[PDB]
């Protein structure tokens, strides 16, 4: 029934970006995405270099980097190619189609020039995807749709979640999967990435809620954990990354059987 | 029953940013917000100067400015003070609370340092507002919650819209109103701003849909029209702004009676 990441990488309808990711996940035995939530370029790059071997993906918020330049992103790409991980800018595009296309391609950040993956909220309707696609398809990029959120009071539930899945299916040339708390699509060509992950129970004072890698990957059927403060706030970020990698990978193997 | 903008500016529970806006709307006879959707700082500033007298608000997308610097925003503030309009950065914050606080205060844009108003999607739950508030309250700023969207397939309907209104009511120290297509709150302390506005019928090929100032202000009961391409794509942007101002203002006067 369920296929390994390496087999999913070969599915007929797989997106090339999804395929590249799934192959390196299998090769490196990692389904960990590092949420590199730091404000200094030097710390971003030092984390990317040290943790590169342990991660399938590095997730950025370029708009919180105090010293962003496109040269910083050049250096990140060098590390991404060296250590084999994708770069995912967690921009949560959420505007009308005509606007998101400019926000994706242009401005100071030129996100589409360096991000393998971006994400989008589905609240504006499918125009958000159509606008992003106009830039992302020519640049051979992929997009994730936010089907569920981890935070307290999330409205991404029920019919909203169903609408995100439909939108993804209907735009499979560009949409490669979901941000979600659990498996939301039965189609194995789609990736599921889940934030709100720590080994210990808890949350923060601004609505974040945590579940463990075993819960998220093993029981809820997601593919990749996105981990921020669980790693970033630790003294030894490399050991912490390895702990989360081993947790997520074994949860995956066990559910594969 | 219905109060003028100048009377609403004095309501007991009015937010100071709302009050300042409502007063200048009354003084200048304008309920037009210019969507300054351009990619060049010089064009932004030239539009702000020429159209300043006709508008209550100038709405930016700082992340599409190819030559953004904080000095550009300094010059915009000078024009805002000279001509009396507020600056609204249409950032559509839509992340967990802990992240939006950094995106609002920090990075290259330092949005909170120059934007009187920002907006937020309600999909993450009320943590999105709580996180923004932590930065915006000390800086005496206001926020608008996106209760409805103009675009085709919008999921901001029904219970989602009701949740946005509740969130606004429960955070009135920071939330000053809504982005919406119509009046969604019966409380006069809240502003309603409506995008998707042109004099002529139509839309674009990426899901934008248009309604007229008379429809939006007169029939649907909103306060302020947000107008982008209807002005920006016109040859004479000053005449176009004046046409939209007069349309929105008379629609308001008529519904006031
Ligand atoms: Cl998230
Ligand atoms: Cl909008």
From Swiss-Prot, chains A, B:
Binding-site list for UMP: 35, 37, 59-61, 95, 99, 150, 208-210, 228-229
UniProt keyword list: Acetylation, Decarboxylase, Disease variant, Glycosyltransferase, Lyase, Multifunctional enzyme, Phosphoprotein, Pyrimidine biosynthesis, Transferase
GO biological process, one term: 'de novo' UMP biosynthetic process
Annotated positions binding orotidine 5'-phosphate: 35, 59, 92, 95, 99, 150, 208-210, 228-229
A cellular component annotation (GO) from this entry: cytosol
Catalytic activity: orotidine 5'-phosphate + diphosphate = orotate + 5-phospho-alpha-D-ribose 1-diphosphate; orotidine 5'-phosphate + H(+) = UMP + CO2
Pathway noted in the entry: Pyrimidine metabolism; UMP biosynthesis via de novo pathway; UMP from orotate: step 1/2; Pyrimidine metabolism; UMP biosynthesis via de novo pathway; UMP from orotate: step 2/2
Record carries keyword Cell division: no
Annotated consequence of substituting residue 90 to N: Loss of OMPdecase activity
Gene Ontology molecular function, alphabetical: identical protein binding; orotate phosphoribosyltransferase activity; orotidine-5'-phosphate decarboxylase activity
Region (OMPdecase): 2-257
Coiled-coil segments: none
The keyword Acetylation is annotated on this UniProt entry: yes
List of catalytic residues: 90, 92, 95
EC number: 2.4.2.10, 4.1.1.23
Function of the protein: Bifunctional enzyme catalyzing the last two steps of de novo pyrimidine biosynthesis, orotate phosphoribosyltransferase (OPRT), which converts orotate to orotidine-5'-monophosphate (OMP), and orotidine-5'-monophosphate decarboxylase (ODC), the terminal enzymatic reaction that decarboxylates OMP to uridine monophosphate (UMP).
Clinical condition linked: Orotic aciduria 1: A disorder of pyrimidine metabolism resulting in megaloblastic anemia and orotic acid crystalluria that is frequently associated with some degree of physical and intellectual disability. A minority of cases have additional features, particularly congenital malformations and immune deficiencies.
Subunit record text: Homodimer; dimerization is required for enzymatic activity.
Family: In the N-terminal section; belongs to the purine/pyrimidine phosphoribosyltransferase family. In the C-terminal section; belongs to the OMP decarboxylase family.
Protein name: Uridine 5'-monophosphate synthase
Organism: Homo sapiens
Organism taxonomic ancestry: Eukaryota, Metazoa, Chordata, Craniata, Vertebrata
Gene field: UMPS
Shown residues within the full chain: 224 to 479 of 480
């Amino acid at each position: 029934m369920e296929l390994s990441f390496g087999a999913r990488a070969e599915l007929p309808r797989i997106h090339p970006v999804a395929s590249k990711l799934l192959r390196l996940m299998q090769k490196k035995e990692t389904n960990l995405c590092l949420s590199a939530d730091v404000s200094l370029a030097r710390e971003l790059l030092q984390l990317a270099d040290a943790l590169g071997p342990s991660i399938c993906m590095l997730k950025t918020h370029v708009d919180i980097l105090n010293d962003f330049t496109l040269d910083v992103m050049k250096e990140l790409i060098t590390l991404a190619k060296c250590h084999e991980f994708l770069i995912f800018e967690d921009r949560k595009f959420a505007d009308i189609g005509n606007t998101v296309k400019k926000q994706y391609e242009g401005g100071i950040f030129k996100i589409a020039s360096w991000a393998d993956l971006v994400n989008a909220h589905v609240v504006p309707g499918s125009g958000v995807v159509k606008g992003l696609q106009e830039v992302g398809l020519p640049l051979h990029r992929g997009c994730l749709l936010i089907a569920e959120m981890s935070s307290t009071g999330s409205l991404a539930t029920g019919d909203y979640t169903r609408a995100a899945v439909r939108m993804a299916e209907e735009h499979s040339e560009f949409v490669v999967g979901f941000i979600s708390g659990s498996r939301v699509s039965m189609k194995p060509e789609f990736l599921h990435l889940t934030p709100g992950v720590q080994l210990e129970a808890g949350g923060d004072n601004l609505g974040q809620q945590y579940n463990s890698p075993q819960e998220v990957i093993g029981k809820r059927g997601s593919d990749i954990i996105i981990v921020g403060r669980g790693i970033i706030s630790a003294a030894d970020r490399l050991e912490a990354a390895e702990m989360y990698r081993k947790a997520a990978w074994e949860a995956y193997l066990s559910r594969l059987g």
